[PDB]
């Protein structure tokens, strides 16, 4: 019986190739709101 | 908790080489103090260890002997000191050590390995292996 290197029956599972850089972080208001809070408390 | 398990393995590695002398000897010779399983040893004194939980490339390693062919190799270890039976296992060209799959014996195979002899008085020196081609005339040894 021929024994050659071949893919398994059905084939290989899917391979990710598309860009996948996640979207993450606080909102624009939250960043500014924290920073402006830190100044105000520091000025006080 | 996990941090303690880490310190457990750390202690177990510090004390797993047989004393303080053992730990210093391995640490300053190989800069590594892992604990592998002794797979075998050779006629020269190299010891072969493995840990299949390590990632491919660190799952096999050798602690070279400290004296080979009369040379002092406590500090001067080079990769040419691994004989050919283990050279194949150590380089992952196979999967079974010579302690279980010995090489076929031959009467001409070197019994004693020899590492890189460059720079030494044993070093190879090239030369022509043929014999003289043109033979010159030899004059008579007597007057005429």
């Amino acid at each position: 019986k021929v024994k050659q290197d071949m893919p398994p029956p059905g084939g290989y599972g899917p391979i990710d190739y598309k860009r996948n850089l996640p979207r993450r972080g606080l909102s624009g208001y939250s960043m500014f709101a924290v920073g402006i809070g830190a100044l105000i408390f520091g000025y006080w | 908790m996990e941090l303690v398990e880490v310190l457990k393995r750390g202690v177990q590695q510090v004390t797993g080489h047989g004393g303080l002398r053992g730990l210093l000897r391995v640490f300053f010779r190989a800069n590594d103090i892992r604990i592998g399983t002794l797979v075998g040893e050779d006629k020269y004194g190299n010891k072969y260890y493995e840990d299949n939980k390590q990632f491919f490339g660190r799952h096999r390693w050798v602690i070279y002997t400290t004296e080979m062919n009369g040379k002092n190799t406590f500090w001067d270890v080079d990769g040419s000191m691994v004989p050919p039976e283990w050279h194949r296992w150590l380089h992952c060209m196979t999967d079974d050590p010579p302690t279980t799959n010995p090489p076929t014996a031959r009467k001409f195979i070197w019994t004693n390995h020899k590492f890189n002899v460059s720079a030494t008085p044993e070093q190879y020196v090239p030369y022509s292996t043929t014999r003289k081609k043109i033979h010159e005339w030899v004059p008579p040894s007597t007057p005429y």
Binding site: - | F108, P121, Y124, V125, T130
Partner: protein, 95 residues
């Protein structure tokens, strides 16, 4: 075997050896003449002659595809052996 010349240099299996007055001997000063000590001529002579029944026998050197190309040797000349032209093994007919 590894004969030694009168000059003290070892003679290789091909019979080469620098003369006494050949300057080219200087390359071995403080070094060595690489010589292979297992003379294949001496090793092949040690093998016993395989005896076979038929008059024509095929030699491939052993190992099948790991040997040499398969050839056949006549065994009629019942005074000398048949020699393989590749591996140098000898054969002789049983009767």
């Amino acid at each position: 075997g590894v004969q030694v010349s009168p000059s003290g240099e070892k003679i290789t299996h091909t019979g080469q050896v620098y003369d006494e007055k050949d300057y080219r001997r200087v390359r071995f000063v403080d070094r060595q003449k690489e010589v292979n000590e297992n003379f294949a001529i001496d090793l092949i002579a040690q093998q016993p002659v395989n005896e076979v029944e038929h008059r024509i026998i095929a030699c491939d050197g052993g190992g099948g595809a790991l040997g040499h190309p398969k050839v056949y040797i006549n065994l009629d000349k019942e005074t000398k052996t048949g020699t393989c032209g590749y591996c140098g093994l000898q054969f002789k007919q049983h009767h």
